[model samples]
Target: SNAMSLEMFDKEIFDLTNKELERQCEGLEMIASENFTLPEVMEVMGSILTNKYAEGYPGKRYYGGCEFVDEIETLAIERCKKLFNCKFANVQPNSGSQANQGVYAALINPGDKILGMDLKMYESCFYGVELDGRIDYEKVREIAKKEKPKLIVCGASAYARVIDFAKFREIADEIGAYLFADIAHIAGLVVAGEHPSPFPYAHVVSSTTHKTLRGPRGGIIMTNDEELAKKINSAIFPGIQGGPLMHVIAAKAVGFKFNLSDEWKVYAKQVRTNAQVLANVLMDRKFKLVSDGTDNHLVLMSFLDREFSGKDADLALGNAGITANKNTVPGEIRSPFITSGLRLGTPALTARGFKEKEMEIVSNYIADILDDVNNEKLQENIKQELKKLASNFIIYERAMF
Candidate 1:
């Protein structure tokens, strides 16, 4: 129809997109921070909204021709509010880190003391993750009282256990500090009830819509305080970012619709159940699981006792056509480049219709590969076998709609 599509407009880009889709379908994605976004979300992502300069917010934009973009943004904001059960939501930050940055800008000033997982820009106090793979809440409380920090960030990247936000709330309240929950990785589980919420406990919550939420690559900031919400808007706009990406805002709305459904609840539950299966199989095989077991979507396998590095195990899995990442465990010994652990998640595979049975099969194959780490031939055979399994759970028929 009048050369309207990418195929007619540019074959190189179109062909590469098709090839990427093939790769995604052929291999199983167990990466802890990744998910397959919906085609309906992608459908809006390449729309005309991309051309619109959506400054400020819905009704009070600095640019003209924001009439429809305003509707898209409002819908996204409202859906975000309902999804997280917050009174305010700003779906404007470019990514999860940006959301946190905006949160800091709106609340804290420069050179102030903050307690969280960092030592960078601001003076910070950090907490430790115990050998059992859980955070030391007692130690965190101790550090908070001594530091009397301005803010406390409660979240994790590779943490396989459920975050007890109430404990964080307790610590923050003791110090009269602001509590910020960075639920970037588990936003999907939090909203789906697979994990706990941050509201009433966390003074502010920030999340990336891309991970388990299966939305477009963007971030969202939420809060129940109206005054804090106003400050957040200004921080994200004048304080940090410029104009919001309208197309991504629309896609966030679409993903919010998917996450709000009853089926999404089932999907999230299956995510945890499948992760449990992975944990059991790996543990039964004598691999040390970080946290011992998972209550959420990912399981971290620590390889400290074993001779090989985490990168070694990660490479073996990659050769076997499974996508998992190497991570640093609590008692980390290896260099950051070569970590002591591997993190695997069920979100993407669960999205591909993998159940407990398929998880067991895949989990067994993972153990088999790790058992004979040096056997490249065995890895190739398992790769082909899992390729067949992956074919049955195809992610999509086309790259673009």
Candidate 2:
């Protein structure tokens, strides 16, 4: 059932696959949305788990011969609980977005009042109802308490600071409300103890498996409350999805196991260290950093202070091979597409063994690109240098195998 044992007789297909990976291996991925997966995690993702249709769950499957599938799923749930220190976990929601949807379904009714931070909180979606430049937390909390909303959602995509879950918990308790946290963008850091853990405070915790976690692409739900766990299980199954992505789940298991290793702790620590390094470098170069600087893995800087729109800056950076996304600052004037800020991260490179010094180089590259927007020749030269530096750290050395 394993795909690893299957032979690819066509050289053309093999070449395409190799070239795609080669491109990634040789490029600087500064986008906060992406991260590199482990080689062992890849092995499970491309393995026999693909063939199974163990639709329902472990013992309560919709089909037969689900004994092994059940074991893997159970192991995934158990590992997630251990990693997040929760009483329950559901690893079936397709992705982090679905995990949020499932949680929403479990707890609240449609049109129920939900308070969320602005969209510019992070790059990831599946949380909140408002976009960037529209955050009114004071108003949101006031209305939430008066309306007694079913759930109070906290945190967001372009958020560059640490969340205060304790405050959120107190608010929820006062209004007889539930607190749900979508830490998809920061799950890896949370798991590695780099960021504040959401457990014991949040009624629901959801996140994608990659990013700082450095595993396969998937979602996980964790909670210390038993009743909330039961509701979540039903919500993920009959309420939202049907069949689970078994291959991805297997890969998640490998990722959870990997996170348990000392190597992962070191990797997680580097992620924070590199982020701090990049933030300082960008600040030194006079980039207008949001909230001054990051207390987490990303840096949100406004181009308005640099006399440019984020759209122009994003294109210029992409032309030079450094990938990042344009974003909106809290009080931005430009639209989301042509935003006033840039959201970039150092997690993936840190996962690939990059250190604090590497962040200086990345910042310099970005600074040069921004400083000389009209210099095509210089940008091209910087692209080549970035590629050379990236090549020295392969995401998977045995990509050929």
Candidate 3:
């Protein structure tokens, strides 16, 4: 079932997918919010579990004959708890956004004052409506103190640093806020002991299975508070969603299993090292990085000299086979879409066994591409060069694209 074998567009999807794999292996993936899932995990994701439609949790499923599905969900929940050392775990929310929404639904009223991180409101979480990405935590908190908000969400998407859980806890304590740290981007790093864990302090932690966790596309919730846990479970099942995707849950288990492995610990370490190398290289290249440097796996690069915006640079770099997303830095002067900065990461490349050297090369390649954004011939040339470099780091099975 090679992607290239099927003629979706008179060309096999397998073949097309394979070619993309080849591209990934050959070039550099600096996109901070993306990663490569382990082949075993991917296998479980595509397995027979996809056939099932057992609604609700294991024992109290709405469907019949969900014994195996129950086992899968339980296993995922157990693994997540073990990894994060939490009292409760929910592996059913469809995505990180869904997981966060479930938390909001469970804890706060519809028009409640919630203090969420700035970045999450901008790019990574959701995109729609005129008021899509606009949650000013400071401004909200100012008003929240006067009229106490039911809950406060601390962390957000486009994350590049570790949160001060203690500070967030302090704020929550002062305002009776139920803090939700959206550690979606750094969950794998946290599990692997490369980043700070948000347990005990954060009332509820939400994350995606895909991002730095390197699992299937899904969401998870972990918390140390028992009462909050119950609310989250109910919110996920009866409140927000119906049938739990047992197959994705199984893949999450596989991902969690890999997380428990010593190999993943090393992988997590590499992710940080590669990130530092890329950040350092970019710094040396004269790109102004937000926060000066990264405390985790992501890097936010600012285009100080270029007249082009973050969106422009993102498109140009993507054309060069170096994928990344535009981001809004603190004290941003540009609009969300045409921001002054671009964000990149080393998680996927590190998972594929790229080290500090590869990161440096990636940074150089990105700088080169950005320098010639308007030059299509140069961009194409850079893509070919990136392809050659990526081939040396291929980790997935050959799929034709």
Worst 10 residues of 1 by lDDT: 1-10
- Over 126-174, each residue of candidate 3 has an lDDT whose tens digit, in order, gives 2111122233344454655775656666665565666667766776788
lDDT against the true structure, per candidate, is: 0.90, 0.80, 0.78
The most accurate candidate by TM-score is 1
lDDT by residue (tens digit), candidate 1, 266-384: 99999999999999999998999988899999999988899888999999999999989998887899899999889999999999999999999999999999998999999999999
Measured on C-alpha atoms, candidate 2 has an lDDT of: 0.80
Better by TM-score, candidate 3 or 2: 2
Name the regions of candidate 3 deviating beyond 4 angstroms: 1-16, 120-147, 371-377
TM-score, every prediction: 0.97, 0.91, 0.88
Choose the strongest candidate by lDDT.
Answer: 1
Q: Per-residue error at 75 for model 2, in Å?
A: 1.3
Winner on lDDT (1 vs 3): 1
Q: Which pairs of residues collide in model 1?
A: none
Cα lDDT tens digits for candidate 2, 270-381: 8878889888988898777877778788888877666788888888888888888998876678988799888999888887778987789889889988988778888899
